[PDB]
């Protein structure tokens, strides 16, 4: 379990009893005279929480002061002209604007204290100039009802050296420009070398003004530095100088072959002023005004008059996570902007990514249904576009190059568990002193969970359903590797298989084929999966041979297999015949692939099916095995045997064999109803090796998840039942040169097509693999509205008489739900640090934590995140699409993955106690996440000890389908 492992978190303070006041100044449409900066510096020295910012009205700046307990001396810290406009206390409620300002106020004191302990700041990082010398970045969030917390991100960075006299000397003799790191904000500048002396009159005043805001030590004083083509005198205390798994591929290769203060003052109000709650990362259109712009972002991002955005939306952070993540091109362009810059780059990239038959695609999606198978970031451009605003503002006071390399690439240039925790305990005294002038150290999961105000035990492991005898069996998932020893039997009654193999006339490859499939027959029959004997006609062990060369691989492929698929009884004398009394074997065509394209091999299956009688074609499947398996190096056989059995999909019978022998009766009524034209063909019932065991009216829950492909031309969707009984996938074409509302309508029709084929009420939970868009939320709210879901209940009653009498049999919808899954990238847990079995090495664990995540404390769509929940899992996640990890790529490689699940719609009790019908949005998540964990156990490979991949089974197949389309297209 992870209930005692250490996180990277710190309960900084408690908000009970806090008070705040706001002072506002209005100016015309020198720092000493300015009242905002004179008061901000004065209160900073007294060590009180103070922060200043601008307002929408030009020439309006406001200062906020936070304190605990006794009031400070307000007759001296505030300038004469400043007048207050707000006086609030904690009991009067804390809005989101105050919440986001309090975080920066704490970071203002924290920044000041860190530089007193020989920490130098470079942008978002704090590092110690010359491993126990690691850069740590602080981000804040409010966890629990009132506790304020922080999460420390620790990363490894190349060494950085303070500027000294020796460094300057080599700069003057150097012809090439000298590259150095500038400022707290990591500006990139060239050291001219015109060093200064402290005795000079200019540096007497320049350093004097610097000491007011940043704590500068105390001999070299300042140096002239040229940044982005603009020269400025900058203090020499803040200048910094930088330092400036194969064995398997190789042996496989072998087998193959032989067989200036004004400038930095403005920047602090744009780059570091953004310190917002990390819980609201999963956000969408502003509910107040139905827009993607709101709150105070109207001053940070380049009119319309939004009024009082009470919710927690922040378009500055919306552009960060909504630039390359999986989103509709229609939704993404709204966030960036077509007319403005960077809109053309997205459109140009999308077209450049692009630069066959319908029935080929349908075949492709059938093979992935089974259980077993650059762009400069917009947020980076925002910082570059902030350089021009600050530098031009600073240059005016004194009286493409900037956007390219304004910021030093040091922060973009990149472990162990003991050393990281050494610094985490090292940072506790710094946090302790800053607020006090208590604080809990790196919190364990139990302590983190306990103060959420809501059990830290891992989620229970579900049991499976199998057949040991002719009866069922409720068995643990850890008994799968002993399937043959315990002689268990699966669902579906051991479907029998007859196979044909296509092999070239090479002796080396032919001999291996006979032994491999002879072994496959043994393992298939050793497991109670049925009979794997070849086609009953005996032609040299049921192997068909062939004979640029793909053409030769196709002529015999179609000319031979096409037509092919189109009285003494000594021992029987003793026993009498039993009688007439009262399911054809499935045909699988095994294809060996000499090529180390494949579609060339799949083109047989397209040609064979058309030239076949319908009854034979209804049960015919294709499997492709690479030739390297036979020749070069068993867990492959068990995976292949189970994959072949799961893909059989026994068809539903077309006759009842009643033998009425009379004009009419109940037997005839069933028969004539079975052959009605409206009944679909090729039912193809699905039977897996195992399903989840039941746990104590009748209903069902449909779990559906979807995501767009690498191009926005296709929507890939997958579905599964509550107990994993059904598993189907769909591909929807959206290719227009409106474009997404029609696509979502087709998806909702597909989901409606599945529920209406049953005879019991359903519950629908919709998932999204990536980050939900800002238009998808609008479109889904219209489809999944109360009025709509109720309307189709009545329309169903009109068509069917049977649904009219009994409502318990009509396949109506009782509830709806929309949930989006995305990574967090802020928290990390190291299993190595503790406080009989070692969890990460030999076991998989999963913890959850859900909270209502209200926007403020104390029509169709409400607030953007209704409820949020963390998904901590030790088991590895499969290969996700690249855009999934675009926001926080560092979290991709850590062994315990953090995932975030959010609630968006929650339409409860459409027809008018299940958790999905509770108005508490926290109960809905813990039900959905619990079923997400339970469905993840269906991925346990019988050849493997534990689950192959994390998350629900439907998410896993959808991901397998996405890569299959990506690779072959």
């Amino acid at each position: 379990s992870l209930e005692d492992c250490h996180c990277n978190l710190f309960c900084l303070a408690d908000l009970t009893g806090i008070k705040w006041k706001k002072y506002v100044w209005q100016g015309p449409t020198v720092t000493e005279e300015d009242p905002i900066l004179s008061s901000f510096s004065r209160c900073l020295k007294a060590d009180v929480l103070g922060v200043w910012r601008r307002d929408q009205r030009p020439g309006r700046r406001e200062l906020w002061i936070f304190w605990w307990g006794e009031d400070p001396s307000f007759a001296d810290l505030i300038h004469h002209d400043l007048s207050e406009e707000e006086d609030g206390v904690w009991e009067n409620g804390l809005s989101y604007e105050c919440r986001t300002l309090l975080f920066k106020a704490v970071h203002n004191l924290l920044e000041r204290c860190l530089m007193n302990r020989n920490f130098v700041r470079i942008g978002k990082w704090f590092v110690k100039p010359y491993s126990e010398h690691l850069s740590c970045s602080f981000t804040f969030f409010l966890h629990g009802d009132s506790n304020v917390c922080t999460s420390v991100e620790i990363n490894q960075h190349q060494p950085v050296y303070l500027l000294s006299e020796e460094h300057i000397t080599l700069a003057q003799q150097s012809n090439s420009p000298f590259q150095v790191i500038l400022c707290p904000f990591g500006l990139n500048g060239t050291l001219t070398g015109q060093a200064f002396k402290m005795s000079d009159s200019a540096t007497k005043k320049l350093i004097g003004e610097w000491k007011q805001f940043y704590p500068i030590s105390c001999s070299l004083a300042a140096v002239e530095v040229l940044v982005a083509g603009v020269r400025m005198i900058y203090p020499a205390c803040f200048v910094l100088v930088p330092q400036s798994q194969t064995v398997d591929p190789q042996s496989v290769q072998k087998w193959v072959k032989f067989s200036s203060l004004y400038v930095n003052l403005i920047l602090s109000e744009s780059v570091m002023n953004l310190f917002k709650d990390c819980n609201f990362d999963s956000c969408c259109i502003c509910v107040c005004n139905m827009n993607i712009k709101g709150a105070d972002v109207g001053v940070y991002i380049p009119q319309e008059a939004q009024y009082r955005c009470t919710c927690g939306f922040s378009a500055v952070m919306n552009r960060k996570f909504g630039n390359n993540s999986g989103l509709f091109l229609e939704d993404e362009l709204d966030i960036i902007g077509r007319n403005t810059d960077c809109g053309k780059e997205a459109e140009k990239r999308f077209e450049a990514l692009r630069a066959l038959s319908d029935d080929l695609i349908l075949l492709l999606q059938d093979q992935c249904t089974n259980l077993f198978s650059n762009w400069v970031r917009v947020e980076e451009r925002d910082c570059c576009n902030d350089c021009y605003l600050a530098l031009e503002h600073g240059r005016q006071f004194m009286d493409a190059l900037v956007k390219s390399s304004c910021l030093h690439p040091w922060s973009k240039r990149n472990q162990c568990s003991q050393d990281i925790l050494r610094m985490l305990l090292s940072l506790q005294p710094v946090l302790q002193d800053a607020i006090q002038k208590g604080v809990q150290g790196p919190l364990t999961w139990q302590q983190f969970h306990k103060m959420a105000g809501r059990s830290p035990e891992p989620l229970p492991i579900p049991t499976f359903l199998l057949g040991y005898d002719y009866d069922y069996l409720v068995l643990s998932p850890f008994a799968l590797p002993y399937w043959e020893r315990l002689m268990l039997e699966p669902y579906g009654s051991q479907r029998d298989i007859a196979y044909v193999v296509l092999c070239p006339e090479n002796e080396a490859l032919l001999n291996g084929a006979k032994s491999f499939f002879r072994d496959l027959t043994a393992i298939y029959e050793s497991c109670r999966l049925g009979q794997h004997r070849p086609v009953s006609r005996l032609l040299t062990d049921g192997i068909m041979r062939v004979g640029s060369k793909l053409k030769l691989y196709a002529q015999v492929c179609r000319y031979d297999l096409g037509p092919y698929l189109a009285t003494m009884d000594r021992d029987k004398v003793g026993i009498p015949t039993d009688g007439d009394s009262h399911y054809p074997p499935a045909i699988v065509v095994y294809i060996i692939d000499p090529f180390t394209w494949t579609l060339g091999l799949l083109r047989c299956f397209l040609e064979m099916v058309q030239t076949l009688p319908p009854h034979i074609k209804s049960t015919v499947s294709v499997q492709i095995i690479p030739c390297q398996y036979l020749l070069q190096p068993p867990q492959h056989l068990k995976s292949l045997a189970f994959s072949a059995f799961t893909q059989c999909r026994r068809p539903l019978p077309t006759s009842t064999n009643v033998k009425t022998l009379t004009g009419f009766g109940p037997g005839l009524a069933m028969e004539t109803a079975l052959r009605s034209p409206d009944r679909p063909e090729c039912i193809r019932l699905y039977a897996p090796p195992f399903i989840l065991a039941p746990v104590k009216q009748k209903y069902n829950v449909l779990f559906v998840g979807y995501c767009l492909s690498h191009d926005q031309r296709w929507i890939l969707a997958s579905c599964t039942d509550l107990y994993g009984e059904l598993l189907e996938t769909c591909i929807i074409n959206i290719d227009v040169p409106s474009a997404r509302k029609f696509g979502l309508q087709k998806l909702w029709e597909w989901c409606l097509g599945l529920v209406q084929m049953s005879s019991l009420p359903w519950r629908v939970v919709i998932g999204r693999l990536g980050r939900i868009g800002h238009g998808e939320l609008k479109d889904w709210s219209c489809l999944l509205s109360r009025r709509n879901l109720q309307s189709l209940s009545k329309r169903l009653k009109d068509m069917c008489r049977m649904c009219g009498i009994s409502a318990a049999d009509s396949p109506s919808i009782l509830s709806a739900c929309l949930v989006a899954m995305e990574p967090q990238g802020s928290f990390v847990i190291m299993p190595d640090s503790v406080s009989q079995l070692n969890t990460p090495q030999d076991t998989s664990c999963t913890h959850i934590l859900v909270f209502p995540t209200s926007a403020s404390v104390q029509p169709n769509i409400l607030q953007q995140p209704l409820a949020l929940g963390y998904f901590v899992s030790t088991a590895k996640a499969g290969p996700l699409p690249d855009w999934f990890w675009s926001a926080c790529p560092q979290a991709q490689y850590q062994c315990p993955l953090f995932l975030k699940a959010s609630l968006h719609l929650h339409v409860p009790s459409v027809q008018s106690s299940h958790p999905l019908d509770s108005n508490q949005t926290s109960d809905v998540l813990r039900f959905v996440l619990e079923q997400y964990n339970a469905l993840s156990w269906l991925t346990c490979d019988p050849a493997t000890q534990d689950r192959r991949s994390c998350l629900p089974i439907h998410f896993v197949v959808l991901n397998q389908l996405y890569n299959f389309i990506m690779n072959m297209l």
Partner: protein, 183 residues
């Protein structure tokens, strides 16, 4: 002092000791059981985490060289080699290099007993020679490890819903090619 605990002053305090035993290795191999006595001393100080890869990459390498010919000194008896191999393993990325010096160990199948919500309790080791399908029951494996329950057969939920659908006659689903068409 190190295990209970001037950040890196003790590293050079031991490389001189490494030079001491580097000088007197030839004295150590002269005896027979005295090969082991200072072989085991350095084991307990390495495994404690006194030195890791981040502290001194070369430091770890230096103790290994000594360790190869202490074991090569056993052969040049083979049995003495095993006599200490069992006494070296009886106590137990950095561990990858340590185990490479020892011989290949014997491997046994491990089964994970759930013992029920339904958590996991213990792990059992069974030799791979006891697992054969000739016997009808499970002799080494116990059904109570997995919390097995025998429940009677029932008709599949998916199959039954198809039968009950015959009385409904809802709308006919799309031909599965209606989705892959231009908008």
């Amino acid at each position: 002092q190190i295990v209970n605990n001037p950040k890196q002053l003790m590293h050079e305090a031991l490389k001189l000791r490494l030079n001491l035993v580097g000088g007197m290795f030839d004295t150590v191999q002269r005896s027979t059981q005295q090969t082991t006595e200072w072989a085991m001393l350095l084991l307990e100080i390495i495994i404690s985490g006194t030195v890791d890869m981040q502290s001194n990459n070369e430091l770890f390498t230096t103790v290994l060289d000594m360790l190869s010919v202490l074991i090569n000194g056993t052969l040049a008896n083979k049995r003495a080699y095993m006599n200490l191999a069992k006494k070296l393993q009886k106590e137990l990325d950095s561990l990858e290099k340590v185990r490479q010096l020892l011989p290949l160990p014997k491997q046994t199948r491990d089964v994970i007993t759930c013992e029920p919500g339904l958590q996991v309790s213990t792990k059992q080791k069974i030799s791979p020679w006891d697992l054969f399908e000739g016997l009808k029951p499970s002799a080494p494996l116990s059904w109570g490890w997995f919390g097995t329950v025998r429940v009677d057969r029932r008709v599949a939920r998916g199959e039954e819903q198809q039968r009950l659908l015959l009385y409904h006659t809802h709308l006919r689903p799309r031909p599965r090619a209606y989705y892959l068409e231009p908008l």
